[PDB]
Amino acid sequence: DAPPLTLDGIKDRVLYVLKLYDKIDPEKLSVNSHFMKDLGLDSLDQVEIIMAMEDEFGFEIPDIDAEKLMCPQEIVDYIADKKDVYE
Amino acid sequence: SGYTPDEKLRLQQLRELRRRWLKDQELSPREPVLPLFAVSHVLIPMWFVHYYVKYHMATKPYTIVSSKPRIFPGDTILETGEVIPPMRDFPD
Amino acid sequence: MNIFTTSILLIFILLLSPILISMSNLIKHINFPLYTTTSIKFSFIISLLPLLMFFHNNMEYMITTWHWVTMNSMELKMSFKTDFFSILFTSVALFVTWSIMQFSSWYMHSD
Amino acid sequence: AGGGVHIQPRYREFPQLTRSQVIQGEFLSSLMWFWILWRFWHDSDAVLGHFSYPDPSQWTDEELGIPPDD
Amino acid sequence: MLCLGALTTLFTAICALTQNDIKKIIAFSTSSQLGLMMVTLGMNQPHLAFLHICTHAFFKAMLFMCSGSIIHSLADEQDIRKMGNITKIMPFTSSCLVIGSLALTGMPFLTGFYSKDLIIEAINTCNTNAWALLITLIATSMTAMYSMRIIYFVTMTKPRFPPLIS
Amino acid sequence: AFCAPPAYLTHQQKVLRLYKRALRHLESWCIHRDKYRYFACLMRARFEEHKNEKDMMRATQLLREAEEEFWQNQHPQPYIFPDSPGGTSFERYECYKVPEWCLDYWHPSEKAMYPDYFSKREQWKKLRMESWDREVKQLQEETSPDGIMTEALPPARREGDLPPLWWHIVTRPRERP
Amino acid sequence: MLKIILPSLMLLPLTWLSSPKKTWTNVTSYSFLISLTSLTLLWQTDENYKNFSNMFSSDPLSTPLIILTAWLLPLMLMASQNHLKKDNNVLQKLYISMLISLQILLIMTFSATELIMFYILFEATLIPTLIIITRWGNQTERLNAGIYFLFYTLIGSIPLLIALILIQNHVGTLNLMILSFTTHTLDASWSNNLLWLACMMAFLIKMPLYGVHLWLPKAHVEAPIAGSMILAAILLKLGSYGMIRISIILDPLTKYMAYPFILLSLWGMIMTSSICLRQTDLKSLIAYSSVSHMALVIASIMIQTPWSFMGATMLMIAHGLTSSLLFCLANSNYERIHSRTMIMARGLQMVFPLMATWWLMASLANLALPPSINLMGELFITMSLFSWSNFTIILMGINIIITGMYSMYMIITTQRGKLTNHMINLQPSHTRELTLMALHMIPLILLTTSPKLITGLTM
Amino acid sequence: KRLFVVKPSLYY
Amino acid sequence: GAHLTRRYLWDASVEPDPEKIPSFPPDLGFPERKERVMVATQQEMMDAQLTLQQRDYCAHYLIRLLKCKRDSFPNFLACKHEQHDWDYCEHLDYVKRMKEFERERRLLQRKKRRALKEA
Amino acid sequence: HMTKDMLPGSYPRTPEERAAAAKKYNMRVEDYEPYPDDGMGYGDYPMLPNRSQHERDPWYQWDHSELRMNWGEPIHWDLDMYIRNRVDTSPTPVSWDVMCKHLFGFVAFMVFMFWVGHVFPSYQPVGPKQYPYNNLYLERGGDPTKEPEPVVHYDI
Amino acid sequence: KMELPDYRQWKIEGTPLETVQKKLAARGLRDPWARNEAWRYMGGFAGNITFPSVILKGFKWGFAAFVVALGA
């Protein structure tokens, strides 16, 4: 029923959520910006981020494929690749 | 952890190819090149059924049997002409 | 009252009509969901006619349509009873079915 | 998003509602309440019952054939 | 069958109280109502049992298509946990859902009421297992409970559905 | 599903994968969002402490008593998403995911329509056969000295080459047919 | 009945004389018409059965089969045009002739008045069958399977030979008509108790009983599709036809000499039905399905109540058609898959939409769906068995539950689930494959409309 | 963006 | 019910057994008690096809209802007085069946009082 | 295409044979634990853990997706049973014993209570219903010729 | 393209998250994802829904309809 996503609508939502996480500054979040080496978050906060995304887009990023959703972009192509968005 | 620098390129590249496959899957214009009635199926079926029920079933023995009609006190029987006696008066 | 018998036999014929349309090549040309939804609708109305009869008079009917085998002593035949249980249920079932097929068209859209 | 759809999606906002959606919903519910109220007035024997239970313990011993001892 | 109908009524109803799947809760209610239908057949009251079959069909059909509407409208979420405040977002189904819910709970002067309480009081008046009589009545209170569970979680609560709304 | 399974699991990935099961099994017991967003930042606390334990032995003794605390304090019916294994829509649409090597037995009439579709499909099949040699050779020339071998496959490493073994990760039946 | 037979013989000259390219169509087209002449026997219109001539007769029990025997030759020749299309043009004309002789012989055996004519023709059918199984059998083990099929039948056969020559001396003619209208009442001696076993055992062997049925799973496994169709549809039923005509004599003993077999069959029905539940080879599962559904028949041809007998006649004709249908579709999967394994090839409906409808209808015929002659048959055997002892429903009740489970499992793990990733790509369905099926089921639908024709001698 | 829907060959 | 408690708890000696309600003689305590009466003729019922169970001593008011339900067909809401009557007849029968039960009860008590007082 | 050496053989008696079989079955030589030698046919077939395909990681790209089994990995003897359809050995939040006891306890308590019930039934304070004529003797289909012992019902 | 409401719009005060925010705070803790869970309570869906309100939806007109009919 609902409209299919896009590679720039799956990117604005991913940045949106993260900009609402208090620890991640909302003005230094850039899609090519790593969660743990550049933004500062710890390991436990990666799980929490991914989980937000799993609840923003309604599907589960498997464990092994989600121990690596580091860049705030990998999340944007992995979500899209899993949902077949060729833009 | 974090993707290995040589797995963020096998996912880099293969995603790039998947995007082209899905573009190619897209159909071009023209792609598909191909080279009141209510009464109809309520009345036409009906005539047939009736033909069947009034000229086979009805005709054959014990094919459409019905519980006796209900006859109450004081109501007339059309076929014979009798009038069912009125019942004993309800005292209360 | 043939109107009663014919009606009980007719609901089955009307509902079977969607089944053989799909057997022939005709369904590709007309719309199957809309056509099926309409015929159940008409079946419910046809079911109502015996229901009023029963209520007016409270009478039943055993209809032996076709004989299948004599099998010696135990003859086997196709019989539809029209007792209060059968026609009351027949009307309720088709109303629910008429509701669901229209729901089905919306729910399975894109199937 | 092609405007062709019937209604648009909303992000973190209360989905806009069509006049028909609200009116039909209030219609079905209000008839439910009109029917419950109409029948309650015309036929209030749903709770009360139209027959009063007799107190089985007030039946004069004459009423039941309790022959006086002896 | 009075005995087994009775056991299924409560057994299925108690299971329904904690089930978190909307379709599953309605299905258990389908079984619980038929358990009541089995009970009336067991108390040799065939005509009223048939009366509940007809009334049961109208409301259970409604609730399932009502949830069909909620599941399809949401991104195929079949769990009451992530579904909330459908009453304001979708009044048409919520109105249909509560109409159906009250019919399931035998609200006075609705289709369940005409047939269901006849069955209840039939039990309260016949000679029957004491265990069957007590379970059937609390089974009726549970039917109200799980009915309450559905509208509170599905309809009257802050929304918990995924953020994009369509 | 995409990346390959590691042989053994580290301490971390075992701890950090409980933080997921745990928090996600806390949102079944605590349904309302507020209660959750509360009862959960209290969970992190539990993991937040005992974060810097350097005594491995201890750490693997907090982990082994965490996963037993959890097993006995888990929800029987958790919230598993609609489309994930164990879900409600798992593999529902798979009845429509035909495997794409089946459009090769289509009658010349069927493929007559849908014309440009097969014009692009024949290009891709040329891509596949044009590199199998450079691919398999790559797969082999880069076979690291015999030893540990994982299911990870190499990237391209040269222009024109296509990631080795790419015909079924690309060309994979679309998810929702 | 020499039109159902002489025109048949002439098929052999046609398979040989005809052009290599046109040999297949001349033979298949002509035997379709040979089946049409066979339909004339169905014109009974009176109780008196039809004694065509001294040696050749057709009564209600044989007539429903002679038509099936004539019907399958066309189908057998249509199911084996693929494999056997890789041969040298003289191996084909041998296979076609072998199939032709089977129904010539089988038509006569089912249409034979003298019981020893049955024996000579009865045991001859092994020659054509063993050649079909051994000569063209794909697996390394068909030499073995052939041995099992020849010895189990042969060791049973020589006792029957001694028994029938024995009754001829005791009564004076092996003519089924007379033997029926003459007083042959065994005397419950210890010896007679052996005669009875001698006559029934040979028939009980080719009708797989639980004790001696290992020959059938092994034989159908490596047998080519045409041989497996013949064994299931006509060959096994030769044993049933024999038990119906031979127990006219030996009338008193079977009252008490049957218990052993009846119990062997009903317990056998459960175990044979159950092992179908976990057998990896599809042809294996259909074969054990055939043993169980034939174990019901030996338990109705022994209870000997009118209903049993025609329950038997209904089921034998019906299960014959259904089994072939199952063996025929199993082959279509085998030829594209190239393996008999059930676990491989999952999801076919996704790729072969119609064959799956044929698979579904074949399975519903396999289990007892009600507007089918298959159910009428079991319903009747079930009734009589219940009459024999009300407890029988328990064992004939575990079989129905198991029969539902394996029949649907064949559909669930072969024709549903996710598609196999990339077995050799499965070429689309030929129209021959689909017709060979349609030809099996369209008659199953037509017979179910008027079950009277296949009801047996009893009714 | 009509997309091509792969389907088993359906002529046979 | 509470009557059960009297029987399941306490003493059942003086509590009636539902299986045998007219446990004591029909005429105990009665000066030629008038028997009951059935207004409808066996045939009337048999012609109105009343279900055997519904052939109660109220069968007569039923036949009336059924009459006014066949007549007045299109209107199913107008044979309302007839239903009250039938129901009443029956309420006035349930009460009887209750009076009979209470009478038994008491009579059995008489036995306990009388018999014991005799001891 | 399959050599006899690449197909199952007899119980590995000597340790070299136990390490040769482990190659055939693509296993680790220290994981090949032949099924016990009691002569029931198992032969050299590995005794793989009796765990159903249900708990095989549901996300990994299993070559054979639906059997959740890879290509080459030794298949389990009873894979016709522990498949994703037929049987489910998978861990349960509640211990199995606890389950068996609880379920059956419930069953028993219920069955019992139902018995307490039949002993002590619930019946209103109402005497027996009274049918006219002779308890409808004739209409209950009684014999017209033989009149029944009159069963009379009196007022109050 | 669909736009998205300004991330800033969302704030925890004024919603039940705020009271959860204040207690977690006594504990010294502070949950960082609250703001994300704000639109739940933020607007439109902000009003508390009471159980009588659903059961009694439309009762006002239903009774209004009843009175009128009762009049005629």
Ligand SMILES: CCCCCCCCCCCCCCCCCC(=O)OC[C@H](COP(=O)(O)OCCN)OC(=O)CCCCCCCCCCCCCCCCC
């Ligand atoms: C003969 C021995 C065995 C031989 C086996 C192989 C033979 C192959 C070659 C010959 C094939 C044709 C000859 C055999 C079948 C003959 C069938 C026939 O003649 O039908 C008769 C029927 C008229 O019916 P009739 O019996 O006269 O009426 C009885 C009234 N009491 O005429 C008709 O009504 C025709 C109707 C056609 C369509 C009927 C469809 C009905 C479907 C009902 C079942 C649906 C569900 C089936 C479930 C199956 C599950 C697998």
